[PDB]
Design a protein around this motif. Structure first.
Motif, PDB file in Angstrom:
ATOM      1  N   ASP A  66       0.832  -1.198   0.000  1.00 31.16           N
ATOM      2  CA  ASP A  66       0.000   0.000   0.000  1.00 31.16           C
ATOM      3  C   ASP A  66       0.870   1.253   0.000  1.00 31.16           C
ATOM      4  O   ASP A  66       0.529   2.257  -0.627  1.00 31.16           O
ATOM      5  CB  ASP A  66      -0.908   0.000   1.233  1.00 31.16           C
ATOM      6  CG  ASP A  66      -1.787   1.245   1.239  1.00 31.16           C
ATOM      7  OD1 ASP A  66      -1.604   2.081   0.370  1.00 31.16           O
ATOM      8  OD2 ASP A  66      -2.630   1.346   2.117  1.00 31.16           O
ATOM      9  N   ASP A  67       1.995   1.188   0.705  1.00 32.54           N
ATOM     10  CA  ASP A  67       2.907   2.322   0.778  1.00 32.54           C
ATOM     11  C   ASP A  67       3.451   2.658  -0.608  1.00 32.54           C
ATOM     12  O   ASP A  67       3.547   3.828  -0.980  1.00 32.54           O
ATOM     13  CB  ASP A  67       4.070   1.993   1.715  1.00 32.54           C
ATOM     14  CG  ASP A  67       5.072   3.142   1.729  1.00 32.54           C
ATOM     15  OD1 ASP A  67       4.724   4.211   1.256  1.00 32.54           O
ATOM     16  OD2 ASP A  67       6.174   2.934   2.206  1.00 32.54           O
ATOM     17  N   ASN A  68       3.803   1.623  -1.365  1.00 37.02           N
ATOM     18  CA  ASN A  68       4.336   1.814  -2.710  1.00 37.02           C
ATOM     19  C   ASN A  68       3.202   1.946  -3.722  1.00 37.02           C
ATOM     20  O   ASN A  68       2.499   0.977  -4.010  1.00 37.02           O
ATOM     21  CB  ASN A  68       5.224   0.628  -3.092  1.00 37.02           C
ATOM     22  CG  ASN A  68       5.840   0.859  -4.468  1.00 37.02           C
ATOM     23  OD1 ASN A  68       5.344   1.679  -5.240  1.00 37.02           O
ATOM     24  ND2 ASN A  68       6.898   0.181  -4.821  1.00 37.02           N
ATOM     25  N   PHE A  69       3.027   3.151  -4.256  1.00 36.64           N
ATOM     26  CA  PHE A  69       1.974   3.401  -5.234  1.00 36.64           C
ATOM     27  C   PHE A  69       2.199   2.569  -6.491  1.00 36.64           C
ATOM     28  O   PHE A  69       1.253   2.029  -7.066  1.00 36.64           O
ATOM     29  CB  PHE A  69       1.950   4.884  -5.606  1.00 36.64           C
ATOM     30  CG  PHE A  69       1.479   5.694  -4.423  1.00 36.64           C
ATOM     31  CD1 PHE A  69       0.109   5.892  -4.213  1.00 36.64           C
ATOM     32  CD2 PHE A  69       2.410   6.246  -3.536  1.00 36.64           C
ATOM     33  CE1 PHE A  69      -0.329   6.642  -3.116  1.00 36.64           C
ATOM     34  CE2 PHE A  69       1.972   6.997  -2.439  1.00 36.64           C
ATOM     35  CZ  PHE A  69       0.602   7.195  -2.228  1.00 36.64           C
ATOM     36  N   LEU A  70       3.457   2.477  -6.916  1.00 38.03           N
ATOM     37  CA  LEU A  70       3.804   1.715  -8.115  1.00 38.03           C
ATOM     38  C   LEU A  70       4.082   0.258  -7.754  1.00 38.03           C
ATOM     39  O   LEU A  70       4.839  -0.029  -6.827  1.00 38.03           O
ATOM     40  CB  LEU A  70       5.041   2.332  -8.784  1.00 38.03           C
ATOM     41  CG  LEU A  70       4.630   3.588  -9.561  1.00 38.03           C
ATOM     42  CD1 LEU A  70       3.999   4.602  -8.598  1.00 38.03           C
ATOM     43  CD2 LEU A  70       5.859   4.212 -10.233  1.00 38.03           C
ATOM     44  N   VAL A  71       3.463  -0.655  -8.495  1.00 41.89           N
ATOM     45  CA  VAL A  71       3.643  -2.082  -8.254  1.00 41.89           C
ATOM     46  C   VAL A  71       3.416  -2.868  -9.543  1.00 41.89           C
ATOM     47  O   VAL A  71       2.661  -3.841  -9.566  1.00 41.89           O
ATOM     48  CB  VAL A  71       2.664  -2.558  -7.178  1.00 41.89           C
ATOM     49  CG1 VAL A  71       3.045  -1.944  -5.828  1.00 41.89           C
ATOM     50  CG2 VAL A  71       1.244  -2.123  -7.553  1.00 41.89           C
ATOM     51  N   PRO A  72       4.058  -2.462 -10.610  1.00 35.54           N
ATOM     52  CA  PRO A  72       3.931  -3.140 -11.938  1.00 35.54           C
ATOM     53  C   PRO A  72       4.461  -4.575 -11.899  1.00 35.54           C
ATOM     54  O   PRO A  72       5.462  -4.860 -11.241  1.00 35.54           O
ATOM     55  CB  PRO A  72       4.769  -2.257 -12.884  1.00 35.54           C
ATOM     56  CG  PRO A  72       5.706  -1.501 -11.993  1.00 35.54           C
ATOM     57  CD  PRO A  72       4.975  -1.313 -10.666  1.00 35.54           C
ATOM     58  N   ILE A  73       3.781  -5.470 -12.608  1.00 39.94           N
ATOM     59  CA  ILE A  73       4.188  -6.873 -12.647  1.00 39.94           C
ATOM     60  C   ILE A  73       5.540  -7.035 -13.342  1.00 39.94           C
ATOM     61  O   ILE A  73       6.395  -7.786 -12.878  1.00 39.94           O
ATOM     62  CB  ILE A  73       3.133  -7.706 -13.372  1.00 39.94           C
ATOM     63  CG1 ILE A  73       1.754  -7.466 -12.731  1.00 39.94           C
ATOM     64  CG2 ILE A  73       3.502  -9.189 -13.282  1.00 39.94           C
ATOM     65  CD1 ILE A  73       1.775  -7.805 -11.232  1.00 39.94           C
ATOM     66  N   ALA A  74       5.726  -6.330 -14.457  1.00 43.82           N
ATOM     67  CA  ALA A  74       6.981  -6.407 -15.206  1.00 43.82           C
ATOM     68  C   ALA A  74       8.187  -6.426 -14.254  1.00 43.82           C
ATOM     69  O   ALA A  74       9.279  -6.848 -14.638  1.00 43.82           O
ATOM     70  CB  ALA A  74       7.092  -5.226 -16.195  1.00 43.82           C
ATOM     71  N   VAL A  75       7.985  -5.968 -13.016  1.00 46.79           N
ATOM     72  CA  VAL A  75       9.064  -5.938 -12.033  1.00 46.79           C
ATOM     73  C   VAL A  75       9.596  -7.349 -11.789  1.00 46.79           C
ATOM     74  O   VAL A  75      10.807  -7.566 -11.737  1.00 46.79           O
ATOM     75  CB  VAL A  75       8.537  -5.328 -10.724  1.00 46.79           C
ATOM     76  CG1 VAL A  75       7.521  -6.276 -10.081  1.00 46.79           C
ATOM     77  CG2 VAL A  75       9.688  -5.075  -9.741  1.00 46.79           C
TER      78      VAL A  75
END
Lengths: 42, 42, 42
Positions: free
Chosen positions: B4-13
């Motif tokens: 929740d803290d991290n706005f960005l959470v793209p799968i490509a990660v």
């Protein structure tokens, strides 16, 4: 398919990340052998 | 509510993570030089 | 089944990940070994 859902206990993901860093260090450790004369040791 | 803290959470990660592991394996692969068990180092 | 289980979740974690990737690239760089122009090989 390549990206596991990791629905159950998704935390283990962080633990795996640390494990990878350890593997990288070992790799560098082996490459450390025979120091280059170009770099001047303090 | 994970990350929740991290706005960005793209799968490509996750895809990038796998790529790093492959790079490490190749590094070790070269170091391995595939030693033959037929001959024993002196 | 969890909600903000990790009290600490600083972004500095992502920065460290990128740093590791850089280290791996350098490792590969040495393995690649740049070909010297002094010697010509077909």
């Amino acid at each position: 398919s390549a990206d596991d859902d990791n629905f159950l206990v998704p935390i283990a993901v962080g633990a795996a990340l640390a494990g990878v860093l350890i593997l990288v260090l070992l790799a560098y450790f082996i490459g450390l052998k025979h120091h280059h004369a170009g770099y001047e040791q303090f």
